Design a protein around this ligand. Structure first.
Ligand SMILES: [Zn+2]
Length: 675
RNA sequence: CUGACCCAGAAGAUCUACUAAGUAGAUCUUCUGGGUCAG
């Protein structure tokens, strides 16, 4: 067995006395071993004829798997039964039997929330010890806070039932939105009241060993200037002005559709303005249907082109011009392949007029982003000293990951790097996700003397996922809150590590400095909190809990009533009628389908399975997809592709999700498909 | 029964920017249901 260190025993001492404590310690010091020692001590203390039950909470699937493996390997000699339940192993055996027939259970919090809501698990008195991993998430409406709401409701209710001991592990408690030390202390007291903790455990008497184990890197700040001359922006701005004039020609009241004033090309404000203008122009209703459809389609096309131009400008701001030009070229290829009509022909011709000059400018070596030059210089200088350096690079968007991988591959001066890619799992409109096996494979590859020595990743590599030690951390316009600042800096635990922040905006550096001051405030508040008498702390925590319980008991609100009137669904691009709400059927309360032979004439299928589009020529707006249910193969529609119009009043409305649209939902009937 | 892949819903946290708490864009995570291939 592994020999515990002195500071690990110091951290575990308050928990071995039966107190609810929060354990704060740097990442990489071995808090999992501390939890193992606490669990071992807890299970052995019960007298003959009595047993204890331990539940461990993890927020991510890989963390859950690793913890289950570690616990099973550790406690198999003692004769304890260890199991785990998650999304991939939930609907197999009843949860109550699994809980009753085991000693140590590893869980994702949502499973326990679901089973507490259904009534499968009537109370938390079955467990004798609860362990929360990354316990700083116990706030607002997190599942951790739902479990703690159940716990606190049982506690402050007069029910004379035993309750488990609660242990939390974290590397940073955070300050919330505190500005001074008093507010930080108030926030930390609130967090302690959330977990019912009366002790905060830190390393005091064995600091030298911890500093010998975990090393804190040095933080640097680099500020660069923007491009002096930008012909790319000039050309795109001229095109954007021409498109705005074309839009104003058709709609004379364009400038009164939004209240945003003094908009500028290539900013988030302009994006918000154009989104609002798009949402305003898709509602216009006029007595003549053909001319209304013409105007609406024209405005749709104009606004879409303006939005794409703004996106290209932003991409060019944060990356090379080649990436923005490729983005525009892909959009224009899709537009050409997506219903070429006279307005689309005009827009495409106007773009091809300036395409040659755009391609000429982006290939000039003297127009490169200064941020890229600074990053290349940093990488060269760092890898010259240590050829065995391991690096991690943090970025904001999924497109930047691919752009920087391409730039690194194509850079003749960075031939010593082997980039790796790490993004999230969810699928976006422009990007596909990453599966768990792919992430695991790339993480296994990314190590010293391996296939990769530099990793480009989004915020997926912030928490939970384990990564080999890095001697270099680089932040590319990457600043968040104090918790994220502590988490990102903790990945460079190798001795002599450095952390760099790269930006061209002074506000980012100012915010990082404010974060560095907030960390000192938090440490001061924690140090002050430990000098109080425990009874006073208990009284304050009880008062906070009582107030919060009263507020949350008074906050509950009811649900309104849906509307039974019939409605029409119209194509969002061309305003053509698609179907009525009387034809809509719901499959298993989560799939929406349209029944009837009239709807089959309003769409066409173009090949996963085939999607469905608007049948009207030159529109081809996306409406949904074909799915398989039992024997039937039926299409499903998306509410965000249609405009909802009332039959009587005639007012048109927009919805983004099916739960916002309140109408009578008739369940799907297999035998109904005969009328 | 295991792996691998996809689709449709819903929930949560974080950041930025607007308006008079709400909204828009982005990032990550989780749960539920429906299908495909191989062994
Ligand atoms: Zn259409």
């Amino acid at each position: 067995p592994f020999k515990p260190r002195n500071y690990q025993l110091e951290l575990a001492l308050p928990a071995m006395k039966g107190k609810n404590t929060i354990i704060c310690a740097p990442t990489g010091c071995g808090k999992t071993f501390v939890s193992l020692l606490i669990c071992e001590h807890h299970l052995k203390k019960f007298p003959q004829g009595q047993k204890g039950k331990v539940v461990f909470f993890a927020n991510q699937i890989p963390v859950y798997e690793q913890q289950k493996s570690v616990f099973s390997k550790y406690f198999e000699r003692h004769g304890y039964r260890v199991t785990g339940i998650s999304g991939a192993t939930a609907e197999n055996v009843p949860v109550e039997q699994i809980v009753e027939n085991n000693d140590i259970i590893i869980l994702t919090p949502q499973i326990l929330v679901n089973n507490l809501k259904k009534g499968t698990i009537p109370s938390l008195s079955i467990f004798t010890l609860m362990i929360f991993d990354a316990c700083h998430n116990t706030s607002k409406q997190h599942p951790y806070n739902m479990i703690m709401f159940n716990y606190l409701d049982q506690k402050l209710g007069g029910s004379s039932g035993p309750l488990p001991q609660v242990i939390g592990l974290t590397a940073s408690v955070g300050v919330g939105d505190a500005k001074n030390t008093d507010e930080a202390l108030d926030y930390i007291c609130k967090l302690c009241a959330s977990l019912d903790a009366s002790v905060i455990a830190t390393v005091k008497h064995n600091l030298e060993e911890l500093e010998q184990v975990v090393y804190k890197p040095q933080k640097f700040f680099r500020k660069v200037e923007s491009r002096i001359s930008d012909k790319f922006k000039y050309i795109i701005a001229q095109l954007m002005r021409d498109t705005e004039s074309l839009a104003k020609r058709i709609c004379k009241d364009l400038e009164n559709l939004s209240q945003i004033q003094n908009r500028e090309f290539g900013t988030q404000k302009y994006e918000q303005w154009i989104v609002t203008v798009q949402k305003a122009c898709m509602v216009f209703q006029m007595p003549d249907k053909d001319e209304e459809s013409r105007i609406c389609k024209a405005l749709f096309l104009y606004t879409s082109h303006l939005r794409k131009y703004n996106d290209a400008l932003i991409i060019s701001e944060h990356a090379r011009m080649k990436d923005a030009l490729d983005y525009l070229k892909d959009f224009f290829s899709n537009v050409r392949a997506a219903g070429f009509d006279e307005i689309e022909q005009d827009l495409t011709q106007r773009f091809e007029e300036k395409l040659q000059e755009l391609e000429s400018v982006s290939r000039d070596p003297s127009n490169e982003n200064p941020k890229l030059e600074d990053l290349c210089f940093i990488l060269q200088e760092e890898y010259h000293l240590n050829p065995e350096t391991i690096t991690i690079l943090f970025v904001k968007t999924r497109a930047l990951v691919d752009a920087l991988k391409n730039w690194i591959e194509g850079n003749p001066k960075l031939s010593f790097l082997k980039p790796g890619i790490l993004t999230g799992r969810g699928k976006t409109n422009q990007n596909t996700g990453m599966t768990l096996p792919a992430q695991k494979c790339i993480l296994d590859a990314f190590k010293a003397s391996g296939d990769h020595n530099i990793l480009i990743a989004t915020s997926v590599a912030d928490e939970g996922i384990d990564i080999a030690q890095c001697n270099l951390v680089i932040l590319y316009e990457y600043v968040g809150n104090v918790i994220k600042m502590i988490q990102t800096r903790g990945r460079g635990r190798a001795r002599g590590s450095k952390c760099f922040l790269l930006t061209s905006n002074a506000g980012v550096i100012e915010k990082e400095q404010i974060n560095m001051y907030k960390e000192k405030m938090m440490n001061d508040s924690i140090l002050r909190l430990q000098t109080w008498d425990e009874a006073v702390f208990r009284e304050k925590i009880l008062h906070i809990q009582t107030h919060e319980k009263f507020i949350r008991d008074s906050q509950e609100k009811p649900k309104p009533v849906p509307d039974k009137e019939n409605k029409k669904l119209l194509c969002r691009k061309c305003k053509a009628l698609a179907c009525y709400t009387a034809d809509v059927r719901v499959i298993e309360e989560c799939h929406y389908t349209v029944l009837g032979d009239a709807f089959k004439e309003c769409f066409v299928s173009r090949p996963k399975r085939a999607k469905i589009f608007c049948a009207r020529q030159n529109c081809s707006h996306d409406w949904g997809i074909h799915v398989k249910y039992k024997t039937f193969e039926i299409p499903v529609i998306k509410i965000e592709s249609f405009v909802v119009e009332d039959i009587a009043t005639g007012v048109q409305t927009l919805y983004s999700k099916w739960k916002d649209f309140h109408f009578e939902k008739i369940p799907f009937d297999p035998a109904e498909m005969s009328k």
